Symmetry: D2
Subunit: 247 residues, 4 copies
C-alpha cells in the first residue's frame, strides 16, 4: 500500500537523504519551550516520509547505521548552535543502546563534538539482559548526557527498563493521556506513575497532548513536560524558529 | 502534520475508503482482480492503517472497520459482475474468531452474487484448527483464501500446512535485489514450485520494474502486483486508467 | 528423558492433574486460597505445561486442557465449602473469546456453589473491549479476576486500565535482589499503592525467604506465594501438610 | 510452578554449575553417528535442569555470558578429545551471533584452542538487520567451522535467515515431521524444503525423530541426518560412550 514506489524510497536511502525534524517539549508550569525531540524524516523525490513508513527498507538495505549516525551528528550540530539553551533528544533503538561497539563510538563522537553534553538526551526506543545496556548508558551519562525511554508501559517490560537502566525521563505516548474525562482508573494510574518517577528522582514527558483540558489535568498531576499537537507538530528547525522567535 | 483529534473524528465518523491495487496475470498481462486496501478519510487527509491503526485500537473500532471493508468490497465485486476478484485483508485473530467468520459467512451468502470473486487475505499472522474450520465453511460458498507476506514473520510454512490456503502472497523484499542474489532466486523458485505442488498459486507484491518481471515470469509466478503496474487507487480512478474495467 | 510419544499418549488420554500452590495472607499468616496449576501425568513422569505446551499446540488440545482445569478447580472449591479460593489460569486469547467465556460463565452458574471462591488468572498477555465485557459477565456471578506477572511483558498498565482486575500478581523477579535495589523497592511500593488505589490487592509470587517477607509486609503486599510457604502440591498432600485445609 | 525453589537455582548459576549434554545425530543412509548436538544443563543440589526451566534466572542474573563461554569451552575440549571423528554443535542465540564483540572473542578462542575447526557447528537459536551477523559468521567460517539454524520455519523469518546468512545446515523441530501418515501437504512441504537446502548446497537435520515409520519417510525424502528419541535422548558424554562404544 504505497502512494509512492519502493524504488524512489530505496534511492533516497542510498543518497542518505534524511532530515531531522524537531517537536517542542514545553515546561508544564511556565509553558516555556525547554527542548525538542529530534524525529528523523526521509526526503524523497516527491515527498517527505516519517520512520513508520520507510523502516522496512532501511533494515533490508542495512542502512540503520547511516541513519543513526545522521541523527546523532545533525542533533549535535543543532545543540551546539543553540548555545546550550535547549536540549535535543535522539531516538536510539534498544539494540543500539545495548551495543558496546556502537555506544563506544557514540561516546567518542559526543566527547569530541558536542559542546553542551547536558543538552543531549538519548531516548531509548524499540524496547533481555540489561547490564550491558546499563553500562553503555552510564558511560555516556558520565559526560552529562540525559537518558529517557519512550512508550512507557505500552512497550516491552517498561518497569524493568525503569528498574535496571539509568533513566532520567519517562515519556508516555498518546493513548496514556486520552479519554481522561471518563477514565478515573487512568487518572489514578497516571498520578501513580508520575509520583513514582519523581520518587525515583526523574521527570515525566507526556506526548500526544492535544487540548487544554488535558493540560489542566496533567499539570495538576505533576507532569513535568508536554509534547503534542496543541503546542506544535514536528517541524524543520527553520519553521520552528519562524514560529517561536525565542529559539 | 495532522492532529490525533482529526484522526479520531474521522474514525468516529467511520470515514473510510477502500482503494484497489490491480493484480495482473503473468501469462496474459491482463488485470484479473484487485487487492482491497482500507484508508481513513480525515477532514484534510487520507491515511493508510499503519498511520492510524493504533488509534483504531484506542477507539475499539477494528470491527467497524472490518464491516466497512467486507461490505464495500462485496458491493464492488457485485458491480463488476464477476469479471474481477477483490480481496479483503482479515487479521488472523478475526479469522480465528468463530463468531466473526460465521457472521461474515452468512453475510457473503446473503449479499455476494459472485463468491468465487471474493478473496480473504489473512494478514497479521499461534492456534489453528478453529481458523481452518472457519475458513473452510466460507470456502464452501466459493470464496478463495490467501496469505500475505509469505516468508516474513512467524510460521509461514505452518499456516500453509494447516490452513486451506489457495494463494500465497510475498512482499516487496522477497523479490528485491535479485540481480546478485542467487540464493533468493533459488528460494523463490522453490516456493513457487511448492505452492504449485500444493494446488495453489503465487502473487508477488512490490513489482517495481521490467527486470523483475522477466525473472518472476521465468520462475512461473502466477500474478504480479506493484507500483510498476499501478499503486493503490480509488475505483473511479482505476476505471479511468483501465477501460477494460 | 522421555519420548514425545509418551507426552502424546498422555495428552491424548487427557491425563492431567491440577496441583495447588497456597496463598498466604500477609496479615494473618493463614492460607487463604490456592493457585491452581495444571500438570501432565505421563506414563512415567509429571510435567509442567512449558515442558509440553507446544505439544498441546500440535494436538489441538488447549480447549480440552482448559475444560479439565475449570471442571477440576470447581469441584475442589465446592469440596472445600467456600473456605478457600482457587484460581485457574486462562490465556488472554480465551479470555477474549466470547464463545469460550459464555460457555465458562454458564458452567460456573450451573456447577459452582461458591462463585466468590473462583478466580480467573489471566495469563499469556492486543484488543480489550470484548475481553472486558466477557470478564464482567462472569464477575456478575461473583468470580474474581487477577493477572499474573505484572511488570513483565506487554501492556501491564493497559490491562490494568482496561480490564476489571481485582488482583495483580507479580513474578519471582519483581521481588528478587531487594537488599541492594532501592529503585525496585520504590517501584514495588508504588505498584502496591496503585493497586490499592484502584480497589484491588496484590499477590507477590516467588517468595523464598523471611527477609523478603519482612520487606513486602512493610510495603503492604496483601498476599504471598512461594517456595518459602509451599511449592505446588496435589491436594491430598496439601491436606497432609495443612490440617486447617 | 516449581518443584524446586528459585534460590537453589540461582545458587547453581552462581557456582557456574553447568553440564553439557549431547544428543547424537545419525546419517540417514548409513545410520552411523556423525556428530552431536551440545545441550546445556544446569546441575543443582537436587536435580539437573534443562534451559527451558532456568532461562529466566540466567537473564535476571545476567549470567548469559558465563553460560555461553561454558558451552563453547566444554564443546571445544570435547571435540579435541574425539580426534576429529565427530562434530559437536553449540547453541548461540541470534543476539550473540550478531555481536561482533562476542563473535570476535569466539573466533579468537576457536583459533587458539580448537584443533578440529571443521568439527564445530554454531547452531543459531532464539531467532533484524543481518549483515553484521553475516560478517560475524563468515569470519568464523573462514576457520572451517560450520553454521546451522534451528526451528526452521517455526522460528522467526526462517526464509530470510536462509537467504542472508551463510547457513550450512537447516534443522527442523519435532512438529515438522509429526502426523505424516495423514499429512500429504506436510509431505510435500518437507520435500520442497529438503530439495531447496540441497539446491542451496546445504544439508538438513530433522530433530524429534521418534519412530521407524518416520525414518522410512524422511530417508525417502532425502533428509541427510536424524536426531531424536528413536536413536538417543541427550546424555552425558560418559553415558554416550557406554551406549555407543564407537564414540
Amino acid at each position: 500500500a504505497m502512494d509512492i514506489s519502493s524504488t524512489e524510497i530505496w534511492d533516497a536511502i542510498r543518497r542518505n537523504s534524511y532530515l531531522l525534524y524537531y517537536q517542542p517539549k514545553v515546561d508544564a508550569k511556565t509553558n516555556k519551550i525547554i527542548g525538542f525531540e529530534g524525529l528523523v524524516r526521509l526526503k524523497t523525490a516527491t515527498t517527505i516520509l516519517a520512520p513508520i513508513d520507510f523502516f522496512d527498507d532501511i533494515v533490508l538495505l542495512n542502512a540503520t547505521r547511516e541513519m543513526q549516525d545522521f541523527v546523532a551528528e545533525t542533533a549535535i550540530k543543532q545543540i551546539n548552535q543553540l548555545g546550550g539553551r535547549f536540549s535535543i533528544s535522539i531516538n536510539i533503538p534498544a539494540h543500539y543502546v545495548a551495543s558496546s561497539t556502537y555506544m563506544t563510538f557514540l561516546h567518542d563522537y559526543v566527547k569530541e563534538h558536542l559542546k553542551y553534553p547536558e543538552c543531549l538526551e538519548i531516548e531509548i526506543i524499540e524496547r533481555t539482559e540489561l547490564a550491558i545496556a546499563d553500562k553503555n548508558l552510564r558511560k555516556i551519562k558520565d559526560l552529562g548526557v540525559k537518558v529517557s525511554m519512550d512508550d512507557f508501559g505500552k512497550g516491552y517490560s517498561s518497569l524493568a527498563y525503569l528498574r535496571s537502566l539509568p533513566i532520567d525521563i519517562v515519556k508516555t505516548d498518546m493513548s496514556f493521556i486520552a479519554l481522561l474525562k471518563t477514565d478515573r482508573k487512568q487518572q489514578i494510574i497516571i498520578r501513580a506513575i508520575v509520583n513514582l518517577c519523581h520518587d525515583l528522582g526523574g521527570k515525566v514527558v507526556t506526548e500526544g497532548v492535544e487540548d487544554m483540558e488535558q493540560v489542566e489535568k496533567l499539570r495538576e498531576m505533576k507532569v513535568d513536560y508536554f509534547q503534542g499537537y496543541y503546542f506544535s507538530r514536528p517541524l524543520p528547525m527553520e519553521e520552528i524558529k519562524q514560529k517561536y522567535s525565542i529559539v
